[PDB]
Structure 1
Amino acid sequence: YDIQAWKKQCEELLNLIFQCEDSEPFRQPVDLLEYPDYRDIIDTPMDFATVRETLEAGNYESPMELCKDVRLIFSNSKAYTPSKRSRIYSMSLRLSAFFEEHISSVLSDYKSALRFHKRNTITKR
């Protein structure tokens, strides 16, 4: 029932993602000189260095907010790919399955800790 435990769990999961070869295209913002039509397709860029910096700054309030920004990395790759058989999109699907497998217990534990805190609210003092 530790309400704060999610933060270190997300730092460790981000460490595993940065060691995965499949994350290399997603570690830093897309290079607009290499992909000049990227911002004609994609409204909101996102990358794993931005996610880690936001976490380490203390600018996520919950693991649900981190999970929304990681899912945006994957939805941007699906929107920019010219083919569902492309190299970089194929890497995004494998990394998305690994992330979803690991984030599910982080989210469940956080939500369980908040419910336990609300069961024990103090009203008489």
Structure 2
Amino acid sequence: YDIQAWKKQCEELLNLIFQCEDSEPFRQPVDLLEYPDYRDIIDTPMDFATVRETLEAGNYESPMELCKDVRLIFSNSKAYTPSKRSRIYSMSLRLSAFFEEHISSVLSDYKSALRFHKR
């Protein structure tokens, strides 16, 4: 029932994501010089360095907020992909599966801890 435990759990999950080769297209903001129309399609760019920096600045109050930003990385990749002939989108799907598999217990433990706190 540790209400703060999610933060270090998210830091470790981000470390595993950065070592994963599938995170390569998502480690830094999408390069607007490489994709000049990117902002005509994507309203809110998001990437794993931004998520890590937001976490380390103490600007996430809960792991649900961090989740929303990580899922936005995958949603943006899905919206910007032209077709199946895209290594980036395929990497996004495997990385999303890995993320969801690992974040499930972080979310559950946090929500359980907060329910215990408010008992």
- CA drift of 1:64 comes to 0.2
Is there any run of 5+ residues in structure 1 with no aligned partner, and where?
A: 118-123
- CA drift of 1:84 comes to 3.1
What is the CA deviation profile of residues 13-51 of structure 1, one whole-angstrom value per residue up to 9, with x for unaligned ones?
000000000001000000011111111110000000000
Asked which structure has the greater CA Rg, the reply is 1
Quick one: percent identity of the two aligned structures?
100
What is the CA deviation profile of residues 55-90 of structure 1, one whole-angstrom value per residue up to 9, with x for unaligned ones?
000000000000000000000000000003411000
> Structure 2 length normalisation: TM-score?
0.97
For these two proteins, the number of residue pairs brought into alignment is 119
The worse-fitting range, judged by mean Cα deviation, of 82-91 and 38-47 is: 82-91
Distance 1:61 1:110 in 2: 11
Distance 1:114 1:85 in 2: 44
Q: Secondary structure at the match of 2:88?
A: helix
> Structure 1 length normalisation: TM-score?
0.92
- CA drift of 1:100 comes to 0.1
Distance 1:77 1:58 in 2: 26
Could you list the runs of 4 or more consecutive aligned residues of structure 1 that deviate by over 2 angstroms after TM superposition? Answer: none
Is there any run of 5+ residues in structure 2 with no aligned partner, and where?
A: none
Distance 1:85 1:112 in 2: 42
CA RMSD of aligned residues (A): 2.0
Q: Secondary structure at the match of 1:95?
A: helix
Distance 2:98 2:15 in 1: 13
Distance 2:48 2:85 in 1: 23
Distance 2:23 2:37 in 1: 22
* Residue matched to 1:107: 107
Q: Secondary structure at the match of 1:40?
A: helix
Distance 2:44 2:84 in 1: 21
